[PDB]
């Protein structure tokens, strides 16, 4: 469950828009940005960045 | 896009920047009317917690050339008054990939801002012609945007072709344009914009809609575009264009 909304790689899928999203590393415990598509995406997808932090916080590669 | 040069100011008047509250660029679109943008479904669905598919959240960008001088002379702002996304367009699939946008107030027209010319539903652009793709996507997938506008030229495939690329997932909606060599592409940023063609006395018409891709500019991996003459009709329907 954090296997899949902090711990999954970031997604960036087929679709060709530009859409400014964040995801939680947690090789660093920090959340980056990415762009996604707009299709398709996994969990560790995020509109903001506090967002991110929040979800994922306290959160360890197992 | 991947592999193109700079646009040349106003050299494609047709081409919109879509902006999304607090977001920045998501998605191109073309002029089609005084009041009318055609786009691509996709961009324009709710997720995260945010309402793309809710007219209020966008500001189209017409006349536009470097995403950093968004005030220049000759660009036009414009809210939007109404999104429609194509009935059977599937999320899934990408099938039926193509939205209408009504201008909250109409487009002025200008040297930098014109309508680009719908083809008929009877219409081929036949595989093997160059065509333009142009936007502010990434020049490399994973990479970043363009700050200003981008062209590349690229082929129309054989349907059969594109279908054999992409086995199982290619309908009659959609149209394989690029080259099997790949290097040049459409990219993330790029979705919703027009391809555009050059046609027997010049003028140019919209082939398709920037949708979808297996990365940007990889081999055997061209774009995938909406076609535009099969909803010639549908466009009408709706706009009165
Ligand atoms: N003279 C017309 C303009 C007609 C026009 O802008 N045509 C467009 C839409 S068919 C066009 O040729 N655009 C594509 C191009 O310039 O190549 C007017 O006053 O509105």
Redesign the pocket.
Known sequence: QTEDYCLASNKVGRCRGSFPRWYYDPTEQICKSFVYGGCLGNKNNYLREEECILACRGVQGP | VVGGTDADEGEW??QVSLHALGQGHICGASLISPNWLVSAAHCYIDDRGFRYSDPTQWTAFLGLHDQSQRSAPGVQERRLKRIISHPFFNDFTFDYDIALLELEKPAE?SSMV?????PDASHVFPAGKAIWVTGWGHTQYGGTGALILQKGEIRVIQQTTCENLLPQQITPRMMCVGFLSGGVDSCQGDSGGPLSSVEAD????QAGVVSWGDGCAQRNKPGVYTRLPLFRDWIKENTGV
């Open positions: 008047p047709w027209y014109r309508p680009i010319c719908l010049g003028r140019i018409f």
